[model samples]
Target: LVSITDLQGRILYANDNFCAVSRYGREELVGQDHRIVNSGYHGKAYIRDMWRTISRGNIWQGEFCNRRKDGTRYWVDSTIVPLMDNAGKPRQYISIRRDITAQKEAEAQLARLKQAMDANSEMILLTDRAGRIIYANPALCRFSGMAEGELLGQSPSILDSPLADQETLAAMQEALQAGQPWSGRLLNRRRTGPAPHDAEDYWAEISTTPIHTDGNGLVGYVQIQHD
Candidate 1:
């Protein structure tokens, strides 16, 4: 991932590793401008910011999507350092990079999944491992008879009633605290709505799944319900 370039952005050296990943030979890379691999994913403003930082002799660290010789794209975790001259100006710049395409893909995939769930009709609820609600999708917001503002950061207990039985609720909490998912027909209560449901008991198929991050412990939980 090591690349050496002159101040004018002329490539002088591309290491063996760089050549291998870039799918270009040493002869093709030398004397070529670094733009040969530009992916066009970054805006001019972003590029200008990086240039301003490095030209001032300050090291810059960021990620960039770069195109390969075969016209495919890859992401690099990059650190750029400027070699300063006696005049305090940069004479050369060295960029060290590592491929992080997989990490980026995983992040984007989760974003897409969240977007899909946001538009889904299912009652979706995300809560912290502490059982405090964080995200309640539109369906859940409407079904709970509460506004989006009221649902966020509130407990699921907001939708519970005494008709659901305090013992069953207690068992559900105990199981969740033990890092177990609880799924069954739940007799939940809704906020005051029209007749027959004014703080009345309603049945729902409820399930809770713990969300975990890679290599770490549980981060949160996803509670889905169907009325």
Candidate 2:
């Protein structure tokens, strides 16, 4: 059993398996912030969402990246729930987790394969179904001349050579709405250029797949480049 204090979210108890996988001894983990094991791979908003959900007495299940005692990284499928006192006030939290490192690694490999296959022809930018940028490949950054931080949280339109046409915009909306992927060419400008550059204008066929949170709600998008 993995448990933490409800008040400050300090680690209270961890089972043998938790100790084994986390590479932390019982003494070292106890009384420490759960952040001791945080891998720092997830963004602030992601952790905030998890805390918000659990604070509201909801159970959260998801894949988490955590660090071992030796500073090695691993992934786990984690289920966290709020434990309550007799009056129903939260007193502790219990997290049941299973090692999912292998599965996560496999998924990463698949993503790499997909990225490699699309490497030559088109640039790729991944975003939320809402079109919020999440992942941008090197080709995307090179072609757009934008840093990842600048590109993230921005609309796909930032790259648009000009504003998208009404029909194209509608089609993009429909694809996300239908949970289906659509392919089309977009006109986007380089971030380094003050205006759209004619030389950078190229036809790119892009495909987007929806990425869901552990709650099975749409959270973001995974885009693939293709000819």
Per-residue lDDT tens digits of candidate 1, residues 43-134? 99888999999989999999989888899988889999999879998999999999886799889998998789789888877766667677
Mind giving the per-residue lDDT tens digits that candidate 2 earns over 1-227? Answer: 35555457788887888887888898888888888899989999989998888887888988789888678889988889898879877777889988987788888997887678447445666666566776677777776777778888876666665654657756765676455767676554555566444335544455666656666456435443423
**Model 2, 76: alpha-carbon shift in Å?**
1.1
Best by lDDT: 1
| Candidate 2 Cα errors over 4 Å, as ranges | 118-227
